[PDB]
């Protein structure tokens, strides 16, 4: 299964517009993943990284995006914060793994890299595995916005500023979420 085409892409998605790649009808094997040394985070929920290679699933999904160091703890079941609530929501009965690694060498740039963005404003919490990519002006007050930025009328997406010198909590992290779905199995290790 083309794990490398997900982990090794050149740029990643912004969290608000997280990328989903279907993986189907291939052989899994989680050896080069788990037995890699370059992963700051590798947590599994509902399964077990040991006995991962010797099981089957109807379908697997790989969601990828970039967030701040301090936000990686929100890519987990039952978490709250701007990311979990308004950008990427894991379900409470999550069955899968979360992999994160520091990408300061790739996604920071002297002077600031502002290409990566997150949704700061949203009336309601995302549902699990919701992807909201609207850029409608957000009404914080009482007068309508009519798609014009102003007081009480804010663009809902905001840039991270990734500079190489920031502390690791402010540094970019590439995250990949592997979701296992047992609804006729087609992904085995």
């Amino acid at each position, epitope marked *: 299964c083309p794990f490398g085409e997900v982990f090794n892409a050149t740029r990643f998605a912004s969290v608000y517009a997280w990328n989903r790649k279907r993986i189907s009808n291939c052989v899994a094997d989680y050896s080069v993943l788990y037995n890699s040394a370059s992963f700051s985070t590798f947590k599994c929920y509902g399964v077990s990284p040991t006995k991962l290679n010797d099981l089957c699933f109807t379908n697997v999904y790989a969601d990828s995006f970039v967030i701040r160091g301090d936000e990686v703890r929100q890519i987990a079941p039952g978490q709250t914060g701007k990311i979990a609530d308004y950008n990427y929501k894991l379900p409470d009965d999550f069955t899968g793994c979360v992999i994160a690694w520091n990408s300061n060498n790739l996604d920071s740039k002297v002077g600031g890299n502002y290409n990566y963005r997150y949704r700061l404003f949203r009336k309601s919490n995302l549902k699990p595995f919701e992807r909201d990519i609207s850029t409608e002006i957000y009404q914080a007050g009482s007068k309508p916005c009519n798609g014009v930025e102003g007081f009480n009328c804010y663009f809902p997406l905001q840039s991270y*500023g990734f*500079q190489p010198t920031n502390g690791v909590g402010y540094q970019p992290y590439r995250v990949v979420v592997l979701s296992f779905e047992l609804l006729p199995a087609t992904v085995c290790g």
Partner: antibody, heavy 117, light 110 residues
Framework: VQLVESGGGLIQPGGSLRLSCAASGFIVSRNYMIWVRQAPGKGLEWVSVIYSGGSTFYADSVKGRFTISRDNSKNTLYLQMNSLRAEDTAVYYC????????????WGQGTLVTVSS | EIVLTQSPGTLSLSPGERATLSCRASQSISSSYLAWYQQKPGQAPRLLIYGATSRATGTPDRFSGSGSGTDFTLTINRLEPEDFAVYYCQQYGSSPGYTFGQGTKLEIKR
């Protein structure tokens, strides 16, 4: 647009109070809303935040005693304070927060809470 | 725990001089998450600068912000009499999510 605070007063150690913050112009339920407090002669201290989606976070010194909430019909923010100690004496501000889009740009006038016995 | 240490604790200048207030963070932070407030006795804080460099609504041009990483600075060019006040810095990026410095008092020199 304005934030008007009320409900402060004198209360005993261990007692309970509820602060309220009637908004105008701002819609409380669409904003990051915070309480910040200032003890007499000292600095600003962040107490609590409620997210427009309902998430709530609390400073360590008040976790388990204080409860932030809101009423969309009254357009008001509340702070329920239980197990009050002398050190909770302060002026309490509600304020609207815009994070990287503007920091804390509007603050109410403040309400005084004294915990004494 | 992130700590903002402001300096000096007290600045004494006369009107029309240049005021330089510093904020030092105990760890490196992105400049996006730093703000400056003015507070006059009896009143609520007034936001002056957010994102280290961006002027809030109603902040005259003599106020300017700068810095990154661990070090941030508020500059008042040509002090005015209404600028004598307490000045606070605030971070809003790191746990618990809101931290203020201890304050700098800008006072009249004589």
């Amino acid at each position: 647009v304005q934030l008007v605070e009320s409900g402060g007063g004198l209360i005993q150690p261990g007692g309970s109070l509820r602060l309220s913050c009637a908004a105008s112009g701002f819609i409380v339920s669409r904003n990051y809303m915070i309480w910040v407090r200032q003890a007499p002669g000292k600095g600003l201290e962040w107490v609590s935040v409620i997210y427009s989606g309902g998430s709530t976070f609390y400073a360590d010194s008040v976790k388990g005693r204080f409860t932030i909430s809101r009423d969309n019909s009254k357009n008001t923010l509340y702070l329920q304070m239980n197990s009050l100690r002398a050190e909770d004496t302060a002026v309490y501000y509600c304020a609207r927060d815009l994070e990287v889009a503007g920091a804390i740009d509007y603050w109410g006038q403040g309400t005084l809470v004294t915990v004494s016995s | 725990e992130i700590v903002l240490t402001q300096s000096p604790g007290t600045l004494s200048l006369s009107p029309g001089e240049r005021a330089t207030l510093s904020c030092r963070a105990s760890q490196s932070i992105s400049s996006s998450y730093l703000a400056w407030y003015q507070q006059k006795p009896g009143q609520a804080p007034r936001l002056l600068i957010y994102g280290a460099t961006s002027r809030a609504t109603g902040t005259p041009d003599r106020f300017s912000g700068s810095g990154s990483g661990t070090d941030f600075t508020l500059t008042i060019n040509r002090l005015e009499p209404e600028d004598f006040a307490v000045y606070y810095c605030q971070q809003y990026g790191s746990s618990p999510g809101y931290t203020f410095g201890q304050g700098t008092k800008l006072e009249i020199k004589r």
